Amino acid sequence: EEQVVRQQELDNLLHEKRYLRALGLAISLDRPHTVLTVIQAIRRDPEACEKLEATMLRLRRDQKEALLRFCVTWNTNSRHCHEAQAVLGVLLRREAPEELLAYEGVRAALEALLPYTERHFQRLSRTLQAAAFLDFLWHNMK
């Protein structure tokens, strides 16, 4: 009876478009896909985007452990990497490096996070090289 009560609350919060509050509960219920859809909905909305890092600090420790291992799977998909990297940015900047070593499964998670990150950085680098074509068109403009 506990899950269905918790499940009932989650559906109400999603229906009310309260993604910031709904982020906490879906992590505790161990829903990776539902959280991923929530993160995408937050970034589309302007005001929710800036309050994302503020909310992530309010989470307790075990929610941060579960969310960190969610980022490993999301970073694998090129379509889902951007929000995965956005979450990882809050983890690295806010939280202390010695404390990151205290997480459980961080060693195994760190193995997979690096190789896909190098792929994404190279792909964005080539886009920057192509983006310089805008400058070339501007000088040839009449």
Binding site: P97, L100, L101, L114, H120, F121, S125, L128, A132, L134
Partner: peptide, 21 residues
């Protein structure tokens, strides 16, 4: 150029942090 650089910089900052860990 402004938007592409910001997306690259976010990934780039994660590159340095993960390497240190």
């Amino acid at each position: 150029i402004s938007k592409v650089s910001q997306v690259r910089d976010v990934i780039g900052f994660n590159m340095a942090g993960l390497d240190y860990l």
